[PDB]
Automatic annotation (TrEMBL), chains A, B:
It comes from Human immunodeficiency virus type 1. This is Gag-Pol polyprotein. Residues 1-144 form the Integrase catalytic domain. It is found in: Host cell membrane; Host cytoplasm; Host nucleus; Virion. Its main location: host cell. It catalyses: 3'-end directed exonucleolytic cleavage of viral RNA-DNA hybrid; Endohydrolysis of RNA in RNA/DNA hybrids. Three different cleavage modes: 1. sequence-specific internal cleavage of RNA. Human immunodeficiency virus type 1 and Moloney murine leukemia virus enzymes prefer to cleave the RNA strand one nucleotide away from the RNA-DNA junction. 2. RNA 5'-end directed cleavage 13-19 nucleotides from the RNA end. 3. DNA 3'-end directed cleavage 15-20 nucleotides away from the primer terminus. GO terms for biological process: DNA integration; DNA recombination; establishment of integrated proviral latency; proteolysis; symbiont entry into host cell; symbiont-mediated suppression of host gene expression; viral genome integration into host DNA; viral penetration into host nucleus. Its cofactor is Mg(2+). The chain holds residues 57 to 209 of 288 of the full protein.
């Protein structure tokens, strides 16, 4: 559980927002890319795994699951690549809810930034600091620290 | 101490590598940029502060310290912006040593990646996982978790 992440791809302003969610905490990292390719997804995962102890990734679709470049990145970074099929159906709804939330926050900051990528990073900040009480940022650190110890 | 980071700018292949080091752990995040501008530094700090609880940043030079855009990002993200003058002289040498180390790792992976940015992220991964025994990634999580609790 401490090492499990889920990929999520959502769209805004004709652009693609790639999101990784740490399933147990709700903590996220995200980037704007022009389109969701294996190459972009691979690079994103490499970045993520250098920054957090990523053991398992549930990929967001079959193209990324199949991608040789994504498989290469997962091999390189020691990530178990899995499918992202919601065997538990409450999963789709949770992802859907998070995308709606992220887009709402993006709307709330959009005028403070010229570029979408900046608004997305503001949204990441607000999401990860939001008190729900602990924040998602607090939860991920606590979860991982408990695991290490 | 849990919230203190140091900026570091180093050069390779006619490009600029911007690094943030969590001083107490040695954990890093890094990006390749075409040149070190206030705009790029501001965006980098926004990303960092959305991902870790960044309280204080020791800026890497006077241009970034002065930059209105960097100041705006620090204000937005709740970061205390400080100078990076090594009042303790062992600091320059530690930064210097880390840049040499990062470049060495980059050299060791450079042929596995077409693009420098990929090699830099491989270097981030290797650096943060390296056991010294705890890794820098383990140290940062432990330090922050102890603070939160
Ligand atoms: O306007 C932008 O999108 C933008 C900005 C602007 C505001 C801003 C950005 C971060 C925090 C507070 C304010 C700055 C750097 C950037 C930007 O784009 C990439 O690097
Ligand atoms: O060749 C690259 O630099 C490159 C690569 C290649 C290898 C690679 C990258 C990550 C992990 C293992 C292998 C892949 C995606 C990318 C890349 O550039 C941006 O997105």
């Amino acid at each position: 559980s401490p090492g499990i992440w889920q990929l999520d791809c959502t769209h805004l302003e004709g652009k693609v927002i790639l999101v990784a969610v740490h399933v147990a905490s709700g903590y996220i990292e995200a980037e704007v890319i022009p389109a969701e390719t294996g190459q972009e997804t691979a690079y994103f995962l490499l970045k993520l795994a250098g920054r957090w102890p990523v053991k398992t990734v549930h990929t967001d679709n079959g193209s990324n699951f199949t991608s040789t470049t994504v498989k290469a990145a997962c091999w390189w970074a020691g990530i178990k690549q899995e499918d992202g099929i919601p065997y538990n159906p409450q999963s789709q709804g949770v992802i859907e809810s998070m995308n709606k939330e992220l887009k709402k926050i993006i709307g709330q900051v959009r005028d403070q930034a010229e570029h979408l990528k900046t608004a997305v990073q503001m949204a990441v900040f607000i999401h990860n600091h939001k008190r729900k009480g602990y924040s998602a940022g607090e939860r991920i650190v606590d979860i991982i620290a408990t695991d290490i110890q």
